[PDB]
């Protein structure tokens, strides 16, 4: 019903689920409670809840509030379950990218490491933090599936979810695998970074949540097609925006420290275009960027690389692509009959995702 | 139908599933194919397939071959899906315990690390191996769920699987969390190590596979109870046997190098009893064991710790517990009507699991 009120509903569904696990986790033991509490806080103090939002929009675009005989609570739990996949993805991503900060706060492995300092116990706290976090992510992923399966959605509705759900989870992990193979090979092709955006972000963040929601409502293939097309375009633009924010955005907007993508050495489309341009502009600048990415750590060294990147003209090219993709994404909403209210919310979601931060 | 022929059927179901993923993985890109190939080999050159075996036995104990109108292929895929959970568990366990060898061959993270030496590319190969393996495990876990959900089991059968399936996956990850919290706190209580055996092994390896199989067949609560009781006892004994093998077993039997549990410093019931005994016997020996576990690496230093452990009398106490649990586990098969052939196979499975290696 509302873009700003929906995340609170998501938090309620999640709190309910986490509470329901407490006795089983307790029966295993108090240290598992301590581990799950770190997952609980990471999940409950979440981001914008963009993925459940899109699932809910997809449900409403397919006219679920009028036609669907699924229980409301069941649909909301299915939408909210995506936050557990997100938890898995982010916790594991942060180990892989070895980041210290997520959402303005310490990453789960960093936070578990700081619990081992207060205990003064046996073993390396850094490896222990990583260890607990691998398992915390596994638990989150297992709980995503449970939250969907035990939602109370009918057997018919659950069977309809398969295409979106099967698609999404392979696509996100596949995209994350492609990402780190680009980081290891120091890759500079735009087209391979494009594939990462398509699978690791677009499918997972926008296209498949919409598909999932529409499928729960029993949406027609024509409705689903338009939503998937919207999700592809807006989803890629969303990632391109986050790439720009990961370099040029204030820490208050991103959660991370300024230019953390340079620290991590992420192989964005921005970087690929920047290196491509700097090879034809200033060999000294290209070399400066190449030596910097994935190595430098001081604020001053990040800023120098960043200004070299900006001086290529790459940022403007990314901005143009964002604008083009936002425009074509929005246009797909006019290809089918969608209720006025939902179309308006889908438009504002897109604009907020790609342009308005 | 057969204990020795069933693992080949499992391999066939798995090969079929993995082949079916190839186009989706290819659409993402060639490096994801390379990553999945490492998971494919790890899964296809598997162990004894004990978990699908027990699921199949549970199905047959509930008289599925006579009464069930589920497709045979669907039941076998559900049984085989447990190998993907195992893959997830083992790949992630090997990162956490930092082991180099699994099943006589290099661990997935060690093998991915050796692929980065042949490429001579950017970044630390050790962290990259761990990185790919975290995601390889995530993919395995996601594929376990898919293989079950898309098995072709009816909506009725899938709804019946929930208790075993929900139970198992929380219990295994929970048990793995409790395990590393015992390793970090250098814990020496028998009762906390018991809980790890109960949840990380018994539930996951024997009790819940049996429950899953019986549930697919629509087994009565009385049949399921007897199988769960058998699974509890035999499952704990199975872990206790593997603890003894992890110290006193030949590498040809275990896959790992001799006494790798001492290298890893695993907090087994054997070690807890050994330290408890050595405190009342020889303070020098207790201290020798305490300084050794999780630290020493040379064959000679492992053997010294091992002989100190054996000299406590702890091994004999574990052997007695194994024998007691095997006897009470087998007895539970007589508490309900189970077909003669299946009861005989359940007996031989138990004996092979706890005594006969
Ligand atoms: C690029 C990418 C997938 C970022 C994570 O998404 P998000 O910004 O929605 O994260 P959060 O859950 O913190 O809102
Ligand atoms: C699945 C997923 C998108 C994880 C985030 O990857 P990332 O490192 O690209 O995003 P972030 O910069 O938010 O860590
Ligand atoms: C203690 C424990 C759970 C060991 C792994 O089980 P397993 O011996 O069945 O492994 P594999 O899959 O190699 O047969
Ligand atoms: C889920 C599970 C049992 C993983 C194996 O743990 P472990 O380290 O006790 O077994 P292994 O000795 O086979 O690594
Ligand atoms: Mg990251
Ligand atoms: Mg990343
Ligand atoms: Mg291990
Ligand atoms: Mg272990």
Automatic annotation (TrEMBL), chains A, B:
Please list the GO terms describing molecular function.
dimethylallyltranstransferase activity; metal ion binding
EC number assigned by the record: 2.5.1.1
Pathway info = Isoprenoid biosynthesis
Keyword list (alphabetical) reads: Magnesium, Metal-binding, Transferase
Kindly state a single biological-process term from the GO annotations of this entry.
isoprenoid biosynthetic process
> What does the entry list as the binding residues for Mg(2+)?
93, 97, 179
Please list the cofactors this protein needs.
Mg(2+)
The similarity annotation says:
Belongs to the FPP/GGPP synthase family.
Spell out the protein name for this chain: Geranylgeranyl pyrophosphate synthase
Species of origin reads Corynebacterium glutamicum (strain ATCC 13032 / DSM 20300 / JCM 1318 / BCRC 11384 / CCUG 27702 / LMG 3730 / NBRC 12168 / NCIMB 10025 / NRRL B-2784 / 534)
């Amino acid at each position: 019903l509302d873009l700003d009120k929906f995340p609170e509903v998501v938090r309620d569904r999640l709190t309910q689920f986490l509470d329901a696990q407490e006795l089983t986790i307790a029966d295993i033991g108090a240290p598992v409670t301590d581990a799950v509490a770190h997952l609980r806080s990471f999940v409950l103090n979440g981001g914008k809840r963009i993925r459940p939002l899109y699932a809910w929009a997809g449900f409403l675009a397919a006219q679920g509030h009028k036609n669907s005989s699924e229980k409301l609570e069941s649909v909301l739990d299915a939408a909210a379950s995506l936050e557990f996949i997100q938890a898995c993805a982010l916790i594991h991503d942060d180990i892989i990218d070895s980041s210290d900060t997520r959402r303005g706060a310490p990453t789960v492995h960093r936070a578990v490491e700081a619990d081992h300092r207060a205990n003064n116990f046996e073993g390396d706290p850094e490896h222990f933090g990583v260890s607990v976090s691998i398992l915390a992510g596994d638990m989150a992923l297992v709980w995503a599936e449970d939250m969907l399966q035990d939602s109370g959605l009918s057997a018919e509705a659950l069977a309809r979810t398969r295409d979106a759900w099967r698609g999404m989870r392979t696509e996100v992990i596949g995209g994350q695998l492609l990402d780190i193979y680009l980081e290891s090979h120091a890759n500079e092709s735009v087209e391979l970074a494009d594939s990462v955006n398509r699978f690791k972000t677009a499918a997972y963040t926008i296209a498949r949540p919409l598909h999932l929601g529409a499928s729960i409502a029993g949406g027609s293939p024509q409705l689903i097609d338009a939503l998937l097309h919207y999700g592809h375009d807006i989803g890629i633009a969303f990632q391109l925006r986050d790439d720009l924010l990961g370099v040029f955005g204030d820490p208050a907007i991103t959660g991370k420290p300024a230019g953390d993508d340079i620290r991590e050495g992420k192989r964005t489309v921005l970087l690929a275009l920047a290196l491509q341009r700097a090879d034809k502009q200033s060999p000294e600048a290209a070399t400066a960027i190449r030596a910097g990415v994935g190595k430098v750590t001081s604020p001053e060294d990040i800023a120098v690389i960043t200004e070299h990147i900006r001086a290529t003209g790459a940022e403007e090219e990314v901005e143009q692509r964002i604008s083009q993709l936002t425009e074509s994404g929005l246009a797909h909403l006019d290809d089918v009959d969608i209720p006025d209210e939902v179309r308006a919310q889908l438009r504002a979601l897109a604009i907020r995702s790609t342009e308005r931060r």
